[PDB]
Amino acid sequence: SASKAISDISLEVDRLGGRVSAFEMVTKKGGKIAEKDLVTVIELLMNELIKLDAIVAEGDVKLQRKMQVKRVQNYVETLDALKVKN
Ligand SMILES: [Cl-]
């Protein structure tokens, strides 16, 4: 069930996105993020990217898969930018 299996990865991406948001706030408020934590989250996101680089769908479901892929790419992009700065 494509649509379902993606909405599932989507739930994990929601949670990982929350961690990204937490890292951003810490940084915004003058705090420091452990490099170890940045790598942990980036790598959990890459695992979701791998899971989504294998879900076959058609029609609007294919669009949902690409949207989740875009979400992950954006978060990794945000995390890479933070790592430079942490
Ligand atoms: Cl697809």
Side-chain angles (χ1 to χ4, degrees), residues 1-31 33-85:
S1 88
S3 190
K4 173 74 287 181
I6 296 172
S7 289
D8 166 276
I9 287 179
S10 181
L11 297 176
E12 182 46 24
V13 173
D14 293 334
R15 195 187 67 80
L16 295 176
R19 295 214 212 187
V20 173
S21 179
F23 286 163
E24 287 180 293
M25 183 56 75
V26 167
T27 298
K28 177 189 182 303
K29 297 295 180 176
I33 301 175
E35 294 291 294
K36 170 179 59 186
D37 293 297
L38 287 182
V39 177
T40 291
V41 178
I42 287 181
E43 267 169 29
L44 287 179
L45 287 163
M46 295 303 289
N47 276 341
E48 296 303 299
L49 197 67
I50 296 171
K51 287 179 186 61
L52 291 168
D53 185 55
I55 298 181
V56 182
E58 57 147 53
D60 293 302
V61 185
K62 180 157 62 64
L63 181 61
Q64 288 305 307
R65 187 187 74 80
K66 288 176 187 176
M67 175 172 73
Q68 294 305 141
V69 168
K70 182 62 175 182
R71 277 225 289 167
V72 174
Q73 288 171 168
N74 286 349
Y75 287 139
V76 174
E77 179 179 19
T78 295
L79 290 177
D80 285 330
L82 278 178
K83 189 173 181 180
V84 178
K85 125 222 295 162

Coordinates of all heavy atoms in Angstrom, one line a residue, unseen atoms left out:
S1 N 0.8 -1.2 0.0 CA 0.0 0.0 0.0 C 0.9 1.3 0.0 O 1.1 1.8 1.0 CB -0.9 0.0 1.2 OG -0.3 0.6 2.3
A2 N 1.3 1.7 -1.2 CA 2.1 2.9 -1.3 C 1.8 4.1 -0.5 O 2.5 4.6 0.4 CB 2.3 3.3 -2.8
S3 N 0.6 4.7 -0.8 CA 0.1 5.8 -0.1 C 0.3 5.7 1.5 O 0.7 6.6 2.1 CB -1.4 6.0 -0.4 OG -1.9 7.3 0.1
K4 N 0.0 4.5 2.0 CA 0.1 4.2 3.4 C 1.6 4.1 3.9 O 1.9 4.7 4.9 CB -0.6 2.9 3.8 CG -0.4 2.4 5.2 CD -1.2 3.2 6.2 CE -0.6 4.6 6.5 NZ -1.3 5.3 7.5
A5 N 2.4 3.4 3.1 CA 3.8 3.2 3.5 C 4.6 4.5 3.4 O 5.6 4.7 4.1 CB 4.4 2.2 2.5
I6 N 4.0 5.5 2.7 CA 4.7 6.8 2.6 C 4.2 7.7 3.7 O 5.0 8.4 4.3 CB 4.3 7.5 1.2 CG1 4.9 6.6 0.1 CG2 4.9 8.9 1.2 CD1 4.4 7.1 -1.3
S7 N 2.9 7.6 4.0 CA 2.4 8.4 5.1 C 3.1 8.0 6.4 O 3.1 8.7 7.4 CB 0.9 8.2 5.3 OG 0.2 8.8 4.2
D8 N 3.6 6.8 6.4 CA 4.3 6.2 7.6 C 5.7 6.9 7.7 O 6.1 7.3 8.8 CB 4.4 4.7 7.4 CG 5.4 4.1 8.4 OD1 6.6 4.1 8.1 OD2 5.0 3.7 9.5
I9 N 6.4 6.9 6.6 CA 7.7 7.5 6.5 C 7.5 9.0 6.9 O 8.4 9.6 7.5 CB 8.4 7.4 5.1 CG1 8.8 6.0 4.8 CG2 9.5 8.4 5.0 CD1 9.4 5.7 3.5
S10 N 6.4 9.5 6.4 CA 6.0 10.9 6.7 C 5.9 11.2 8.2 O 6.3 12.3 8.6 CB 4.7 11.2 6.0 OG 4.3 12.5 6.2
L11 N 5.4 10.2 8.9 CA 5.3 10.4 10.4 C 6.7 10.5 11.0 O 6.9 11.3 11.9 CB 4.5 9.3 11.0 CG 3.1 9.1 10.5 CD1 2.5 7.9 11.2 CD2 2.3 10.4 10.9
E12 N 7.6 9.7 10.5 CA 9.0 9.7 11.0 C 9.7 11.0 10.6 O 10.5 11.6 11.3 CB 9.8 8.5 10.5 CG 11.2 8.4 11.1 CD 11.3 8.7 12.6 OE1 10.3 8.5 13.3 OE2 12.4 9.0 13.0
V13 N 9.4 11.5 9.4 CA 10.0 12.7 8.9 C 9.5 13.9 9.7 O 10.2 14.8 10.0 CB 9.7 12.9 7.4 CG1 10.2 14.3 7.0 CG2 10.4 11.9 6.6
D14 N 8.2 13.8 10.2 CA 7.6 14.8 11.0 C 8.4 14.9 12.3 O 8.8 16.0 12.8 CB 6.2 14.5 11.4 CG 5.2 14.5 10.3 OD1 5.5 15.2 9.3 OD2 4.2 13.8 10.4
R15 N 8.7 13.8 12.9 CA 9.5 13.7 14.2 C 10.9 14.2 14.0 O 11.4 14.9 14.8 CB 9.5 12.3 14.7 CG 9.9 12.3 16.2 CD 10.1 10.8 16.7 NE 11.2 10.2 16.0 CZ 12.5 10.3 16.3 NH1 12.8 11.1 17.3 NH2 13.4 9.7 15.6
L16 N 11.6 13.8 12.9 CA 12.9 14.2 12.6 C 12.9 15.7 12.3 O 13.9 16.4 12.7 CB 13.5 13.5 11.4 CG 13.7 12.0 11.7 CD1 14.2 11.3 10.4 CD2 14.7 11.7 12.8
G17 N 11.9 16.2 11.8 CA 11.8 17.7 11.5 C 11.7 18.4 12.8 O 12.1 19.6 12.9
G18 N 11.0 17.8 13.8 CA 10.9 18.4 15.1 C 12.3 18.6 15.7 O 12.6 19.6 16.3
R19 N 13.1 17.6 15.5 CA 14.5 17.6 16.0 C 15.3 18.7 15.3 O 16.1 19.5 15.9 CB 15.2 16.3 15.8 CG 14.7 15.1 16.5 CD 15.9 14.2 16.9 NE 15.5 12.8 16.9 CZ 16.3 11.9 17.3 NH1 17.6 12.2 17.7 NH2 16.0 10.6 17.2
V20 N 15.0 18.9 14.0 CA 15.7 20.0 13.2 C 15.3 21.3 13.8 O 16.1 22.1 14.1 CB 15.3 19.9 11.7 CG1 15.9 21.1 11.0 CG2 15.9 18.7 11.1
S21 N 14.0 21.5 14.1 CA 13.5 22.7 14.7 C 14.1 22.9 16.0 O 14.4 24.1 16.4 CB 11.9 22.6 14.8 OG 11.4 23.8 15.4
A22 N 14.3 21.9 16.8 CA 14.9 22.0 18.1 C 16.3 22.5 18.0 O 16.8 23.4 18.8 CB 14.9 20.7 18.9
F23 N 17.1 21.9 17.1 CA 18.5 22.3 16.8 C 18.5 23.8 16.4 O 19.5 24.5 16.8 CB 19.1 21.5 15.7 CG 19.4 20.1 16.2 CD1 19.7 19.1 15.2 CD2 19.5 19.7 17.5 CE1 20.0 17.8 15.6 CE2 19.9 18.4 17.9 CZ 20.1 17.4 16.9
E24 N 17.6 24.2 15.6 CA 17.6 25.6 15.2 C 17.4 26.6 16.3 O 18.0 27.6 16.4 CB 16.5 25.8 14.1 CG 16.9 25.2 12.7 CD 15.8 25.4 11.7 OE1 14.7 24.8 11.9 OE2 16.0 26.1 10.7
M25 N 16.4 26.2 17.2 CA 16.1 27.1 18.4 C 17.3 27.2 19.3 O 17.7 28.2 19.8 CB 14.9 26.5 19.1 CG 14.5 27.4 20.3 SD 14.1 29.1 19.9 CE 12.5 28.9 19.1
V26 N 18.0 26.0 19.6 CA 19.1 26.0 20.4 C 20.2 27.0 19.9 O 20.7 27.8 20.6 CB 19.8 24.6 20.5 CG1 21.2 24.7 21.1 CG2 18.9 23.7 21.3
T27 N 20.4 26.9 18.6 CA 21.4 27.8 17.9 C 21.0 29.2 18.0 O 21.8 30.1 18.3 CB 21.5 27.4 16.4 OG1 22.1 26.1 16.3 CG2 22.5 28.4 15.7
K28 N 19.7 29.5 17.7 CA 19.1 30.9 17.8 C 19.3 31.5 19.1 O 19.5 32.7 19.3 CB 17.6 30.8 17.4 CG 16.9 32.2 17.5 CD 15.4 32.0 17.4 CE 14.7 33.3 17.4 NZ 15.0 34.1 18.6
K29 N 19.2 30.7 20.2 CA 19.3 31.1 21.6 C 20.7 31.0 22.1 O 20.9 30.9 23.3 CB 18.3 30.4 22.4 CG 16.9 30.6 22.1 CD 16.5 32.0 22.3 CE 15.0 32.2 22.0 NZ 14.5 33.6 22.3
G30 N 21.7 31.1 21.2 CA 23.1 31.1 21.6 C 23.7 29.8 22.2 O 24.8 29.8 22.7
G31 N 22.9 28.7 22.1 CA 23.4 27.4 22.5 C 24.2 26.6 21.5 O 24.3 27.0 20.3
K32 N 24.9 25.6 21.9 CA 25.7 24.8 21.0 C 25.1 23.4 20.8 O 24.6 22.8 21.8 CB 27.1 24.7 21.5
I33 N 25.2 22.9 19.6 CA 24.7 21.6 19.3 C 25.9 20.6 19.1 O 26.8 20.9 18.4 CB 23.9 21.5 17.9 CG1 22.7 22.5 18.0 CG2 23.5 20.1 17.6 CD1 22.0 22.6 16.7
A34 N 25.8 19.5 19.8 CA 26.9 18.5 19.7 C 26.9 18.0 18.3 O 25.9 17.6 17.7 CB 26.6 17.3 20.7
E35 N 28.1 17.9 17.7 CA 28.3 17.5 16.3 C 27.7 16.1 16.2 O 27.1 15.7 15.2 CB 29.8 17.5 15.9 CG 30.4 18.8 15.8 CD 29.8 19.7 14.7 OE1 30.1 19.3 13.5 OE2 29.2 20.7 14.9
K36 N 27.9 15.3 17.2 CA 27.4 13.9 17.3 C 25.9 13.8 17.1 O 25.4 12.9 16.4 CB 27.7 13.3 18.6 CG 27.1 11.9 18.9 CD 27.5 11.3 20.2 CE 27.1 12.3 21.4 NZ 27.7 11.8 22.7
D37 N 25.1 14.8 17.6 CA 23.7 14.8 17.4 C 23.3 15.2 16.0 O 22.3 14.7 15.5 CB 23.1 15.8 18.5 CG 23.2 15.3 19.9 OD1 22.7 14.2 20.2 OD2 23.9 15.9 20.7
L38 N 24.0 16.2 15.4 CA 23.8 16.6 14.1 C 23.9 15.5 13.1 O 23.1 15.3 12.2 CB 24.7 17.8 13.7 CG 24.4 19.2 14.3 CD1 25.4 20.1 13.7 CD2 23.0 19.6 14.0
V39 N 25.0 14.7 13.3 CA 25.3 13.5 12.4 C 24.2 12.4 12.6 O 23.8 11.8 11.7 CB 26.7 12.9 12.7 CG1 26.9 11.7 11.9 CG2 27.7 14.0 12.4
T40 N 23.8 12.2 13.9 CA 22.8 11.2 14.1 C 21.5 11.5 13.4 O 21.0 10.6 12.7 CB 22.4 11.2 15.7 OG1 23.5 10.6 16.4 CG2 21.2 10.3 15.9
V41 N 21.0 12.7 13.5 CA 19.8 13.1 12.8 C 19.9 13.1 11.2 O 19.0 12.7 10.5 CB 19.3 14.5 13.3 CG1 18.1 15.0 12.5 CG2 19.0 14.5 14.8
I42 N 21.1 13.6 10.7 CA 21.3 13.7 9.3 C 21.2 12.2 8.8 O 20.6 11.9 7.8 CB 22.6 14.3 8.9 CG1 22.6 15.8 9.1 CG2 23.0 13.9 7.5 CD1 23.9 16.5 8.8
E43 N 21.9 11.3 9.6 CA 21.9 10.0 9.1 C 20.5 9.3 9.3 O 20.2 8.4 8.5 CB 23.0 9.2 9.8 CG 24.2 9.2 8.8 CD 25.6 8.8 9.3 OE1 25.7 8.0 10.2 OE2 26.6 9.3 8.7
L44 N 19.7 9.6 10.2 CA 18.3 9.1 10.3 C 17.5 9.5 9.1 O 16.7 8.8 8.6 CB 17.6 9.5 11.6 CG 18.1 8.8 12.9 CD1 17.3 9.3 14.1 CD2 18.0 7.3 12.8
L45 N 17.8 10.8 8.7 CA 17.1 11.3 7.5 C 17.5 10.6 6.3 O 16.7 10.4 5.4 CB 17.3 12.8 7.4 CG 16.6 13.7 8.5 CD1 17.2 15.1 8.5 CD2 15.1 13.8 8.1
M46 N 18.8 10.3 6.2 CA 19.3 9.6 5.0 C 18.6 8.2 4.9 O 18.4 7.7 3.8 CB 20.8 9.5 5.0 CG 21.5 10.8 4.9 SD 21.0 11.8 3.4 CE 21.8 10.8 2.1
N47 N 18.4 7.6 6.0 CA 17.8 6.3 6.0 C 16.3 6.3 5.5 O 15.8 5.4 4.9 CB 17.8 5.7 7.5 CG 19.1 5.0 7.8 OD1 19.9 4.7 6.9 ND2 19.3 4.8 9.1
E48 N 15.7 7.5 5.8 CA 14.3 7.6 5.3 C 14.4 7.9 3.8 O 13.4 7.5 3.1 CB 13.6 8.8 6.1 CG 13.4 8.6 7.6 CD 12.6 7.3 7.9 OE1 11.5 7.2 7.4 OE2 13.2 6.4 8.5
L49 N 15.4 8.6 3.4 CA 15.6 8.9 2.0 C 15.8 7.6 1.2 O 15.2 7.4 0.1 CB 16.8 9.8 1.7 CG 16.9 10.5 0.4 CD1 15.7 11.5 0.3 CD2 18.2 11.2 0.3
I50 N 16.5 6.6 1.8 CA 16.7 5.3 1.2 C 15.4 4.6 1.1 O 15.1 4.0 0.1 CB 17.8 4.5 2.0 CG1 19.1 5.2 2.0 CG2 17.9 3.1 1.5 CD1 20.2 4.6 3.0
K51 N 14.6 4.6 2.2 CA 13.3 3.9 2.2 C 12.4 4.5 1.1 O 11.7 3.7 0.5 CB 12.6 4.1 3.6 CG 13.3 3.3 4.7 CD 12.5 3.5 6.0 CE 13.2 2.9 7.2 NZ 14.6 3.3 7.4
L52 N 12.5 5.8 0.9 CA 11.7 6.4 -0.1 C 12.2 6.4 -1.5 O 11.5 6.8 -2.5 CB 11.6 7.9 0.1 CG 10.9 8.4 1.3 CD1 11.2 9.9 1.6 CD2 9.4 8.2 1.1
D53 N 13.4 5.9 -1.7 CA 14.0 5.8 -3.1 C 13.7 4.4 -3.6 O 14.3 3.9 -4.5 CB 15.5 6.0 -3.0 CG 16.2 6.1 -4.4 OD1 15.7 6.9 -5.2 OD2 17.1 5.3 -4.7
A54 N 12.7 3.7 -2.9 CA 12.3 2.4 -3.3 C 10.8 2.1 -3.3 O 10.4 1.0 -3.5 CB 13.1 1.4 -2.5
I55 N 10.0 3.1 -3.0 CA 8.6 2.9 -2.9 C 8.0 3.3 -4.3 O 8.0 4.4 -4.8 CB 7.9 3.9 -1.9 CG1 8.4 3.5 -0.5 CG2 6.4 3.7 -2.0 CD1 7.8 4.4 0.6
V56 N 7.4 2.2 -5.0 CA 6.8 2.5 -6.3 C 5.3 2.8 -6.2 O 4.6 2.2 -5.5 CB 6.9 1.2 -7.2 CG1 6.4 1.5 -8.6 CG2 8.4 0.8 -7.3
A57 N 4.9 3.9 -6.9 CA 3.6 4.3 -6.9 C 3.2 4.9 -8.2 O 4.0 5.0 -9.1 CB 3.4 5.4 -5.8
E58 N 1.9 5.2 -8.4 CA 1.4 5.8 -9.6 C 0.5 6.9 -9.3 O 0.2 7.2 -8.1 CB 0.6 4.7 -10.4 CG -0.5 4.2 -9.7 CD -1.7 3.8 -10.6 OE1 -1.5 3.1 -11.5 OE2 -2.8 4.3 -10.3
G59 N 0.1 7.7 -10.3 CA -0.8 8.8 -10.0 C -0.3 9.8 -8.9 O 0.9 10.0 -8.8
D60 N -1.3 10.3 -8.2 CA -1.0 11.3 -7.1 C -0.2 10.7 -6.0 O 0.3 11.4 -5.2 CB -2.3 11.8 -6.6 CG -3.1 12.7 -7.6 OD1 -2.5 13.7 -8.0 OD2 -4.2 12.4 -7.9
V61 N -0.1 9.3 -5.9 CA 0.7 8.7 -4.9 C 2.2 9.0 -5.2 O 3.0 9.2 -4.2 CB 0.4 7.2 -4.8 CG1 1.2 6.6 -3.6 CG2 -1.0 6.9 -4.7
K62 N 2.5 9.0 -6.4 CA 3.9 9.2 -6.8 C 4.3 10.6 -6.4 O 5.4 10.9 -6.0 CB 4.1 9.1 -8.4 CG 5.5 9.3 -8.9 CD 5.7 8.6 -10.2 CE 4.8 9.1 -11.3 NZ 5.0 10.5 -11.6
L63 N 3.3 11.5 -6.5 CA 3.6 12.9 -6.1 C 3.8 13.0 -4.6 O 4.7 13.8 -4.2 CB 2.4 13.8 -6.5 CG 2.5 15.3 -6.1 CD1 3.7 15.8 -6.9 CD2 1.3 16.0 -6.4
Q64 N 3.1 12.2 -3.8 CA 3.3 12.2 -2.4 C 4.7 11.7 -2.0 O 5.3 12.1 -1.0 CB 2.2 11.3 -1.7 CG 0.8 11.9 -1.7 CD 0.8 13.3 -1.1 OE1 1.3 13.5 0.0 NE2 0.3 14.3 -1.8
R65 N 5.2 10.7 -2.8 CA 6.5 10.2 -2.5 C 7.6 11.3 -2.8 O 8.5 11.5 -2.0 CB 6.8 9.0 -3.4 CG 8.1 8.2 -3.1 CD 8.4 7.2 -4.1 NE 8.8 7.7 -5.3 CZ 10.1 8.1 -5.6 NH1 11.0 8.0 -4.6 NH2 10.4 8.7 -6.7
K66 N 7.4 12.0 -3.9 CA 8.4 13.0 -4.2 C 8.3 14.2 -3.2 O 9.3 14.8 -3.0 CB 8.1 13.6 -5.6 CG 8.4 12.6 -6.8 CD 8.0 13.2 -8.1 CE 8.2 12.3 -9.3 NZ 7.7 12.9 -10.5
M67 N 7.1 14.4 -2.7 CA 7.0 15.5 -1.7 C 7.8 15.1 -0.4 O 8.5 15.9 0.1 CB 5.6 15.8 -1.3 CG 5.5 16.8 -0.2 SD 3.8 17.4 0.2 CE 3.1 16.0 1.0
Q68 N 7.7 13.9 0.0 CA 8.4 13.4 1.2 C 9.9 13.5 0.9 O 10.7 13.8 1.8 CB 8.0 12.0 1.6 CG 6.6 11.9 2.1 CD 6.3 12.9 3.2 OE1 5.2 13.5 3.2 NE2 7.2 13.1 4.1
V69 N 10.3 13.1 -0.3 CA 11.7 13.2 -0.7 C 12.2 14.6 -0.5 O 13.3 14.9 0.0 CB 12.0 12.7 -2.1 CG1 13.4 13.0 -2.6 CG2 11.7 11.2 -2.2
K70 N 11.4 15.5 -1.0 CA 11.8 17.0 -1.0 C 11.9 17.4 0.5 O 12.8 18.2 0.8 CB 10.7 17.8 -1.7 CG 11.1 19.3 -1.8 CD 12.4 19.6 -2.5 CE 12.6 21.1 -2.6 NZ 13.9 21.3 -3.4
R71 N 11.0 17.0 1.3 CA 11.0 17.4 2.7 C 12.4 17.0 3.3 O 13.0 17.8 4.0 CB 9.9 16.7 3.5 CG 8.6 17.4 3.4 CD 8.0 17.4 4.8 NE 7.5 16.1 5.3 CZ 7.2 15.8 6.5 NH1 7.3 16.8 7.5 NH2 6.8 14.6 6.8
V72 N 12.8 15.7 3.1 CA 14.0 15.2 3.6 C 15.3 16.0 3.1 O 16.2 16.3 3.9 CB 14.2 13.7 3.3 CG1 15.6 13.2 3.8 CG2 13.1 12.9 4.0
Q73 N 15.3 16.2 1.8 CA 16.4 17.0 1.2 C 16.5 18.4 1.9 O 17.6 18.8 2.1 CB 16.1 17.1 -0.3 CG 16.3 15.8 -1.1 CD 15.9 15.9 -2.5 OE1 16.2 15.0 -3.3 NE2 15.2 17.0 -2.9
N74 N 15.3 19.0 2.1 CA 15.3 20.3 2.7 C 15.9 20.2 4.2 O 16.6 21.1 4.5 CB 13.9 20.9 2.8 CG 13.4 21.4 1.4 OD1 14.2 21.5 0.5 ND2 12.1 21.7 1.3
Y75 N 15.5 19.2 4.9 CA 16.0 19.1 6.3 C 17.5 18.8 6.3 O 18.2 19.4 7.2 CB 15.2 18.0 7.1 CG 13.8 18.4 7.4 CD1 12.8 17.4 7.3 CD2 13.5 19.6 8.0 CE1 11.5 17.7 7.7 CE2 12.2 19.9 8.4 CZ 11.2 19.0 8.3 OH 9.9 19.2 8.6
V76 N 17.9 18.0 5.5 CA 19.4 17.7 5.4 C 20.1 18.9 5.1 O 21.2 19.2 5.6 CB 19.7 16.5 4.4 CG1 21.2 16.3 4.3 CG2 19.1 15.2 4.9
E77 N 19.6 19.7 4.1 CA 20.2 21.0 3.7 C 20.3 21.9 4.9 O 21.3 22.6 5.1 CB 19.3 21.6 2.6 CG 19.8 22.9 2.1 CD 18.9 23.5 1.0 OE1 17.7 23.0 0.9 OE2 19.3 24.3 0.2
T78 N 19.2 22.0 5.7 CA 19.2 22.8 6.9 C 20.2 22.4 7.9 O 20.9 23.2 8.5 CB 17.8 22.8 7.5 OG1 16.8 23.4 6.6 CG2 17.7 23.6 8.8
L79 N 20.3 21.0 8.1 CA 21.2 20.5 9.1 C 22.7 20.7 8.6 O 23.6 20.9 9.5 CB 21.0 19.0 9.3 CG 19.7 18.6 10.0 CD1 19.6 17.1 10.1 CD2 19.8 19.2 11.5
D80 N 23.0 20.6 7.3 CA 24.3 20.7 6.8 C 24.8 22.2 7.1 O 25.9 22.4 7.4 CB 24.4 20.4 5.3 CG 24.4 18.9 5.0 OD1 24.8 18.2 5.9 OD2 23.9 18.6 4.0
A81 N 23.8 23.1 6.9 CA 24.1 24.5 7.1 C 24.4 24.8 8.6 O 25.3 25.6 8.9 CB 23.0 25.4 6.7
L82 N 23.7 24.1 9.5 CA 23.9 24.2 10.9 C 25.3 23.7 11.3 O 26.0 24.3 12.1 CB 22.8 23.5 11.7 CG 21.5 24.2 11.9 CD1 20.5 23.4 12.7 CD2 21.7 25.6 12.6
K83 N 25.6 22.5 10.8 CA 26.9 21.9 11.1 C 28.1 22.8 10.8 O 29.0 22.9 11.6 CB 27.1 20.6 10.3 CG 28.2 19.8 10.7 CD 28.3 18.4 10.0 CE 29.5 17.6 10.5 NZ 29.5 16.2 9.8
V84 N 28.0 23.6 9.7 CA 29.0 24.5 9.3 C 29.2 25.5 10.5 O 30.3 25.7 11.0 CB 28.6 25.3 8.1 CG1 29.7 26.3 7.7 CG2 28.4 24.4 6.9
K85 N 28.1 26.0 11.0 CA 28.0 26.9 12.1 C 28.2 26.4 13.5 O 28.7 27.1 14.3 CB 26.7 27.7 12.0 CG 26.0 27.6 13.4 CD 24.5 27.4 13.1 CE 24.0 28.6 12.5 NZ 22.7 28.5 11.8
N86 N 27.7 25.2 13.7 CA 27.9 24.7 15.1 C 29.4 24.9 15.3 O 30.1 24.8 14.3 CB 27.4 23.3 15.3
Ligands
CL1 CL 7.2 6.5 -7.7

